[PDB]
Symmetry: C2
Subunit: 91 residues, 2 copies
Amino acid sequence: GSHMEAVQNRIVEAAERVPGVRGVIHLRARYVGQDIWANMIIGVDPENTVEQAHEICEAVQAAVCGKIRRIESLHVSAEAREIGDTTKPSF
Amino acid sequence: GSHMEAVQNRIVEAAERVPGVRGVIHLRARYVGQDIWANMIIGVDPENTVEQAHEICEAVQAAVCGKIRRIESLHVSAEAREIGDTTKPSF
Ligand SMILES: [Zn+2]
Ligand SMILES: [Zn+2]
Ligand SMILES: [Zn+2]
Ligand SMILES: [Zn+2]
Ligand SMILES: [Zn+2]
Ligand SMILES: [Zn+2]
């Protein structure tokens, strides 16, 4: 599984590099031909408004799509995550 | 496709019956044996905090799981949706 491991590692690394991201909670990706399609959920400050959270999703989209050009489609959305959360999964 | 059509119709109807839901934006469901597994994204007020949005996700979970007992697992999260949004899909 190294091909998709390396892709998912790079997606997570790029998304955690965006300020406002509190970990990656869910991520699934797949190849379609040579291209990649992915769905991701990031953790964010629960006190952010949803509008504010979205601006983090858009930053993550930009960062990830920009660092990994084989990604043809990427959907990013958010869930709440408190600091020191052990209630949700993460990478 | 009537079996899954009827299930998805019932999921959407039950979720839109929850105050705070601004449409169902994304929904995918499948059978695993006789049981159903689903992933849904609801629209919410962009001005809600993420914490507040989550309380809507938990209400939708409760409503949907309660009305459709063949659903064994259901993940609900949110995205922003302004009133009169034509920028995101919906059911
Ligand atoms: Zn978003
Ligand atoms: Zn956007
Ligand atoms: Zn979406
Ligand atoms: Zn939620
Ligand atoms: Zn919850
Ligand atoms: Zn989740």
